[PDB]
Amino acid sequence: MSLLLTIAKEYKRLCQDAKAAQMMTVGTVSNYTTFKKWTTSRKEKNPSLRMRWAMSSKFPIIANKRMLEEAQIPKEHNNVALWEDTEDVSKRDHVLASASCINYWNFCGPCVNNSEVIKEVYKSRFGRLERRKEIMWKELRFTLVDRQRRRVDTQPVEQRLRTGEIKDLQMWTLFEDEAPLASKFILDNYGLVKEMRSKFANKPLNKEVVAHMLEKQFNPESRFLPVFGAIRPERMELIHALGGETWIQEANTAGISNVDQRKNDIRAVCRKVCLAANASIMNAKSKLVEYIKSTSMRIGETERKLEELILETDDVSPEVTLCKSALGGQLGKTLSFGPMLLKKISGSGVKVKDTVYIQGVRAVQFEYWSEQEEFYGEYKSATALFSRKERSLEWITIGGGINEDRKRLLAMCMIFCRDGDYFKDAPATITMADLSTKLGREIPYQYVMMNWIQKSEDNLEALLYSRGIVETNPGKMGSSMGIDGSKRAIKSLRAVTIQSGKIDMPESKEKIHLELSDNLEAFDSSGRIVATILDLPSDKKVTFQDVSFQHPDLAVLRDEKTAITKGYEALIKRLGTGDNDIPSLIAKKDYLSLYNLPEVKLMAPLIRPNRKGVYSRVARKLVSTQVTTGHYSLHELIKVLPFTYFAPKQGMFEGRLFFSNDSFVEPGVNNNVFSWSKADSSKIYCHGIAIRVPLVVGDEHMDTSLALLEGFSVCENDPRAPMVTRQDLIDVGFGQKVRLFVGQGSVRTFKRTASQRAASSDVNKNVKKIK
Amino acid sequence: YTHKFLMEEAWMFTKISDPERSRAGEILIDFFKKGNLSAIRPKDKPLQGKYPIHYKNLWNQIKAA
């Protein structure tokens, strides 16, 4: 009780000093960030040596007082003095004490049952240990060529996110009292908020610590590291024990976190979405963004939107680049061409147009590049370095591991090189590859012959032979490349040499973004053709625990099931704004208006007519018995409500299974039609998901009843509205302007509001109108 | 417990069988997955597990397959 009083009196003393008073008054609160930077700048010159000098003394250490007197005896066992009443050296409320007392309280101290609290705070570290438990071992030795520079996620963890948003999570989970109300992350990514805030908020221990450790928990460290060719981010945590220049170890890849495959699943998701945008070429800009913002991903423990995964994902695939290009995410330093990845290390030049002949006696324009340019090629199990000058490869070296992958590197990079022989081979190219069939769209030519090579096996041999072939001289024996990808060096290709080893990958920290052309082409950096149109033509539909919406062009939607699910979505979505909606009715305790709601009449005809009254009786019963506060489940009210509309008859027959066009919805008992999720706010109707954030008091949501309750917004500061703590905000009803302290000290006012709507579309439609 | 399967504590999932659908008996689980089976997922922290992460990953590979 005096803990606040003494703080108030301390403030009185401080503002009584004018020198501190004016510097406390003048300026924003941000000056604290500077003020803290003005202290304890002095550091000792010697890292260990000064510490040795420190521990030499018997009572060097600064330690707290109150806790020790509370728990344990200050005096010693062996009669070596421990405690005094004197505060010496720096003057702070801590009194000095000997080092060994720490060991004593670690021995005989009276503490119990801290075990479970520790681990899930440090689950980053504890997990990095758990993974080492399951692996097996083998030892050998070799002269090993490691891949020298890869920038690769190390210490990977599920639900990894950017630094700013993880700072938001930090603020929300640490303390509610001072926090800003942060829309973008909390609205979309809620349910990780529920978990983290739930486990860490109830037991107030080591607030700062837990914060700064959670910062590192979700932050994969991507550094520039040597790897020996196992690129899974789990092996990156401990490379040292595994591999090195002379090192080798075995039996690893098996154990991994669930992230590594989930990322690939997201790559397939972006594949299907980009195909959906490919189906209709009327406009590719307006549709794909809809397909993005609509889709909802289910991560193993959490539901998260596709937008915040795409924009903020680490790995840039040829597809992922396309999915990001629709949004405002800037990810550069990546070149994607077909399956191959590329990086540009040198030179520059302009795109020029040259019309060259095919074998069908027809002329088609080819856009080529004249530059002296040195780029690094990247393909599966193979790396290389190429340099092109004036539309023809100048210098080439291959660092690839496998012969076939070497040949693929050579080929693809010849396609991007576009020599004259590129025109000479045209075996039936025009009949199909010339005109891609999509609304009669002519597909670019580099990708045309790329696809011609991806077609069959002999097409690779064609252009492989299109390069000059010569018997290589002695001294090139090891560097020479056969037609089939080997080193025998009897016959070899011209202007190419293999290297024994791998080839290092360049890295640049850069962000570049520009809008995309209507054909799924990204002209970013005023050129550079990074989007590679369609990378791979996989026609397949397979998904697991994935959500789609809004005329997806994939038919998962039955007529009866869309009647049920949309009928529910009317009720769930349309309510929560104000009076004559579910929240005000629940606060009034009046459930009769809730029965008569016009959105229930929409759902009425879909119920089974036989038991309609028999269902309505038990339904009305359940809704009425939950009107008493604290006993009501807020999901069960949505589940049970639609059947209450009809006149209750005394059935005496059990109404557990409610047939709505021959499909049952049970109380509790999450099923195909109605999925009732535990300990988070959501729900699943077959292959799709919906939830309503602003007003949920459902009893299991206790941990965030302060975060979830917000549908509010800011209006004006004019009324004098009693200053209400965040826990007092649940009581003030609708249309009530109230005053609240926000964040780091800025105070604003709100009312019960219709939520912020059309953050994007509001601008997008007008921008489309102005053309 | 040396039996290859669990007896007393084992749990059942009932499906009314079609002659032409169940005649395969391999597709039986494919028609099972259209039910509630697909949703069940274990947590990362098992009770009494020897090799949790391996088994969990394999389970996800079964569900994906």
Partner: peptide, 10 residues
């Protein structure tokens, strides 16, 4: 608890 079959796809 004498209750064996359970789950129905329905």
């Amino acid at each position: 608890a004498a209750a064996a079959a359970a789950a129905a796809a329905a």
